[PDB]
Amino acid sequence: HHHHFNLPPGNYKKPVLLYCSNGGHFLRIDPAGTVDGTRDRSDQHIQLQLSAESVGEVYIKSTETGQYLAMDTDGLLYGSQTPNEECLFLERLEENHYNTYISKKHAEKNWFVGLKKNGSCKRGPRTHYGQKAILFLPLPV
């Protein structure tokens, strides 16, 4: 393990919005496979369903399009039509409160899912422990 194992409470029984407190955006997976954040809670591409592959390891899927959130070899988030190794994330508790998602494939490099204040996704190498961009709260739909 390259990381701690403090896990968040709550389960995967229902779909959630992944809210980034950094700029106040909900994680959005566009039908074209594009990923970013939006502040519009009426958007139909921010509803996500998480599922556990192993304890603490999850897939994050758009309920609207069925796409899986994934992080590519250069650190960019994208929507994948099929589940692959780039779609698994280590879900952890952070600052005793928030949920963070580390790319399993690139866990040794500490590449996180994160949104900037302007709503754009952060590239894996630009993320790290301590940033506000990596902190999410799973709000009920």
From Swiss-Prot:
Tissue expression remark: Predominantly expressed in kidney and brain. Detected at much lower levels in heart and skeletal muscle.
Gene3D superfamilies: 2.80.10.50
Effect of K122R: No effect on LRRC59-binding
Subcellular location: Secreted; Cytoplasm; Cytoplasm, Cell cortex; Cytoplasm, Cytosol
Keyword Acetylation in record: yes
SUPFAM superfamilies: Cytokine (SSF50353)
Residues that, per the record, bind heparin: N22
Outcome following mutation: R123E: Reduced integrin-binding. Defective in integrin-, heparin- and FGFR1-binding, and defective in inducing FGF1 signaling, cell proliferation and cell migration
CDD domains found in the cross-reference section: beta-trefoil_FGF1 (cd23313)
Region (Heparin-binding): 116-132
Keyword NAD: no
Keywords, alphabetical: Acetylation, Angiogenesis, Cytoplasm, Developmental protein, Differentiation, Growth factor, Heparin-binding, Mitogen, Nucleus, Phosphoprotein, Secreted
Intervals of motif Nuclear localization signal: 13-16
UniProt-listed GO biological process terms: activation of protein kinase B activity; anatomical structure morphogenesis; angiogenesis; branch elongation involved in ureteric bud branching; cellular response to heat; epithelial cell proliferation; fibroblast growth factor receptor signaling pathway; lung development
One Pfam family matching this protein: FGF
CC annotations in GO: cell cortex; cytoplasm; cytosol; extracellular matrix; extracellular region; extracellular space; nucleoplasm; nucleus
Signal peptide: none
Quaternary structure and interacting proteins, as annotated: Monomer. Homodimer. Interacts with FGFR1, FGFR2, FGFR3 and FGFR4. Affinity between fibroblast growth factors (FGFs) and their receptors is increased by heparan sulfate glycosaminoglycans that function as coreceptors. Found in a complex with FGFBP1, FGF1 and FGF2. Interacts with FGFBP1. Part of a Cu(2+)-dependent multiprotein aggregate containing FGF1, S100A13 and SYT1. Interacts with SYT1. Interacts with S100A13. Interacts with LRRC59. Interacts with CSNKA, CSNKB and FIBP. While binding with LRRC59, CSNKA and FIBP seem mutually exclusive, CSNKB and FIBP may cooperatively interact with FGF1.
Functional note: Plays an important role in the regulation of cell survival, cell division, angiogenesis, cell differentiation and cell migration. Functions as a potent mitogen in vitro. Acts as a ligand for FGFR1 and integrins. Binds to FGFR1 in the presence of heparin leading to FGFR1 dimerization and activation via sequential autophosphorylation on tyrosine residues which act as docking sites for interacting proteins, leading to the activation of several signaling cascades. Binds to integrin ITGAV:ITGB3.
Protein family according to the UniProt entry: Belongs to the heparin-binding growth factors family.
Record protein name field: Fibroblast growth factor 1
Species annotation: Homo sapiens
